[PDB]
């Protein structure tokens, strides 16, 4: 007999409280009652992504909230680790602190990167400066092809678009009332940037570290007997090295 | 894997995803304004930013309506509206022949600009505090002498 | 170096599996070294081979991976690993060699396992002679090929 | 770092942690405070003033105040209001050459 369930059905968090992450241990200790059985669990990266050093803080804001000795020790160990832990078992692994791992990744996955261009008004390559806050055919000749109308056209009309330039007021602004018929983020740069920043910060603030109890419940299933657990994934390199350690999830297929 | 920092500003600090500071984005916005106004335009093919066909039609409609008001209440109509909305359907065809761009300059650099005159230009550096940033954040105000109002400007931003 | 209790118990399990793969029941120390090498190479090929890309395995039968790994491509790997180990031996005060190997997990690279002492430079020191010796050892393989 | 090198007779990565610190200070010597002779007097057409830590998404530790690196930041006066910040135009890579050459002269002396 086989039991199958998906992991996305348990990444439900609200108020920084992950409800499903104990629903999962409850279903685990229920699996532990119907031996012998196979338990499938797919897309585990949904509950297994990397829990989040920076020199940009002492460069521009000047915090320097650290004794010089601990910083010096960090520098020593960082250099030695970058240079001498290349391809050493359990000391040198899925580690972003080593540049040669990133070189290998970009060598096999990506396609050949090119040099800089000889143009002007571009950055280094044939492109423009990129946004500060992140929110088959041969020619172009084959690429030129009451309630609902009003409501949803004006619904598409007012949404915040990040790639719109910004309008400019006449130095003698629109008279009173008319200024209130205009969405503020369409003629004011301060307003548009404030809105984008609030969006970005809010969408980042949804971290809610859940790795530790997932780890303890994974360690929980070796005290049982007579069943097996398959955890299928798609991006095994973006998983946090807390799981890939021997005893948790290392037998790979 | 070594970048040599070619076209950009020398020391720029991070942005809201990382640092909650909003100055680099405020300057990027004006960079994009400059790109649209001077180098590229709104679409492929245009010489610069242009007065759209919709805006021309709207000037026409406003003048017509004010004229009909001033003539009817102080005293060849439906055909006009019909064929006028006929043209309105084009609009998105890139290949319309527009011979001149003087109206864009007259409407955007003369009527929105140097027709007028902004009078808050500069200030002497010696204020009641050691700064304009401190004078502005002060608790009362320091911009009142007849008790005229003596304003100091905001700082100018350079983005090169 | 750098292992703990969980590491060594998982190592014993993977070592038993590696000893099975050679038709034995008793775990030898060679099976432990093979387990270390296996973990390392699997980790590196999981990072290289991902959603697509790939191009590093050599035993899958798919259009990517030829089945027997032609002989002219085995002579080269052996020459590579031999040059690297030879240069790491004649270099004064380099690390010590524990196990040289070719074609681990069928990938087309070698693997030399180095035993090093954590008490000559306590996880923190790098002298100039050591860095120059490392540079020479890392160019030796290409130069011998 | 220079003491370790003069005892052993050979370079190390200890220097790696020294010069980093020194470089920061040396730049603050040349650009922000105006002590050098970069121009005939030491006045330079561009400097990078610090921002307050209030902008960073910050945390709090139970530590003591650092001896030098954080007690010398009592003399800085960062910028706190965003619409009164001054950044001059960046230099021209022929002027940056000469300014960073002044940084080098300081460090070498």
């Amino acid at each position: 007999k086989i039991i199958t369930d998906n992991a996305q059905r348990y990444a439900l968090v609200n108020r920084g409280f992950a409800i499903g992450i104990k629903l999962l241990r409850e279903v685990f200790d229920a699996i532990a009652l119907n031996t012998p059985c196979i338990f499938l669990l797919e897309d585990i990266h949904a509950i297994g992504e990397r829990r989040p050093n920076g020199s940009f803080k002492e460069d521009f804001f000047g915090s320097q909230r650290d004794e010089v000795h601990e910083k010096n020790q960090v520098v020593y160990q960082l250099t030695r680790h970058a240079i001498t832990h290349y391809k050493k078992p359990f000391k040198g692994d899925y580690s972003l602190a080593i540049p040669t791992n990133l070189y290998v990744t970009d060598l096999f996955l990506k396609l050949p990167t090119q040099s800089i261009s000889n143009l002007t008004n571009v950055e280094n390559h044939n492109l423009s400066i990129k946004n500060k806050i992140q929110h088959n055919k041969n020619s172009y000749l084959q690429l030129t092809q009451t309630s609902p109308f009003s409501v949803l056209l004006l619904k598409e009309e007012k949404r915040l678009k990040p790639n719109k330039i910004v309008e400019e007021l006449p130095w003698t602004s629109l008279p009173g009332e008319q200024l209130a018929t205009k969405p503020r983020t369409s003629y004011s740069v301060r307003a548009k940037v404030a809105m984008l920043a609030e969006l970005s910060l809010s969408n980042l603030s949804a971290k809610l570290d859940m790795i530790t109890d997932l780890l303890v419940i994974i360690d929980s299933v070796r005290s049982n007997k007579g069943f097996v657990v398959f955890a299928t994934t798609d991006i095994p390199h973006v998983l946090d090295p807390a799981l890939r350690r021997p005893g948790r999830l290392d037998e790979t297929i | 894997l070594l970048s040599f920092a070619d076209g950009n500003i020398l020391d720029e600090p991070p942005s809201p995803p990382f640092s909650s500071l909003l100055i680099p984005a405020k300057r990027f916005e004006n960079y994009k304004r400059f790109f649209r106004d001077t180098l590229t335009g709104d679409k492929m093919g245009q010489r610069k930013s242009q007065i759209t066909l919709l805006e021309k039609l709207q000037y026409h409609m406003q003048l017509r309506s004010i004229k009909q008001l001033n003539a009817t209440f102080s005293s060849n109509a439906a055909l006009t509206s019909q064929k006028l909305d006929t043209l309105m359907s084009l609009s998105t065809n890139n290949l319309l022949q527009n011979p001149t761009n003087i109206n864009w300059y007259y409407q955007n650099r003369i009527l929105k600009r140097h027709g007028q005159y902004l009078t808050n230009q500069w200030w002497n550096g010696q204020l009641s505090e050691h700064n304009a940033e401190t004078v502005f954040l002060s608790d009362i105000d320091w911009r009142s002498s007849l008790d005229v109002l003596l304003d100091f400007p905001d700082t100018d931003q350079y983005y090169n | 170096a750098g292992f703990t209790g969980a590491d060594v118990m998982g190592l014993m399990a993977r070592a038993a599996r590696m000893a099975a793969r050679q038709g034995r029941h008793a775990i030898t120390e060679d099976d432990i070294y093979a387990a270390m090498e296996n973990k390392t190479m699997e980790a590196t090929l999981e990072a290289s081979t991902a959603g697509d890309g790939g191009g590093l395995v050599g035993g899958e039968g798919v259009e990517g991976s030829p089945d027997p790994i032609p002989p002219q491509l085995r002579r080269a790997v052996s020459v590579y690993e031999a040059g690297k180990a030879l240069l790491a031996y004649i270099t004064p005060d380099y690390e010590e060699i524990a196990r040289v190997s070719v074609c681990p997990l069928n990938v087309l690279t070698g693997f030399t396992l180095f035993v090093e002492d954590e008490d000559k430079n306590v996880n923190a020191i790098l002298t100039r002679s050591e860095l120059e010796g490392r540079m020479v050892v890392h160019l030796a393989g290409r130069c011998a090929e | 770092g220079f003491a370790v090198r003069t005892a052993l007779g050979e370079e190390t990565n200890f220097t790696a942690a020294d010069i980093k610190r020194a470089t920061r200070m040396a730049k603050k010597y040349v650009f922000y405070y105006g002590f050098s002779e970069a121009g005939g007097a030491g006045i330079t057409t561009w400097a990078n003033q610090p921002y307050s830590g209030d902008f960073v998404i910050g945390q709090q530790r139970a530590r003591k105040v650092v001896s030098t690196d954080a007690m010398d930041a009592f003399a800085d006066w960062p910028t706190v209001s965003e619409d009164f910040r001054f950044d001059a135009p960046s230099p021209s890579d022929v002027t940056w050459h000469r300014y960073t050459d002044e940084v080098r002269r300081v460090l070498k002396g």
């Binding site: 540049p99 | 894997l1 970048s3 040599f4 920092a5 | 540079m135 | 890579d93 050459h97 960073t100």
Partner: peptide, 29 residues
């Protein structure tokens, strides 16, 4: 997290010299 790991804002004539020195180290090795 094109892909770059290191950045540097040094002048072009100093970049010349530093890269020449890296190259001669590699030649000797």
């Amino acid at each position: 997290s094109p892909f770059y790991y290191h950045t540097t804002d040094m002048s072009t004539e100093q970049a010349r010299v530093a890269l020449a020195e890296v190259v001669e180290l590699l030649d000797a090795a």
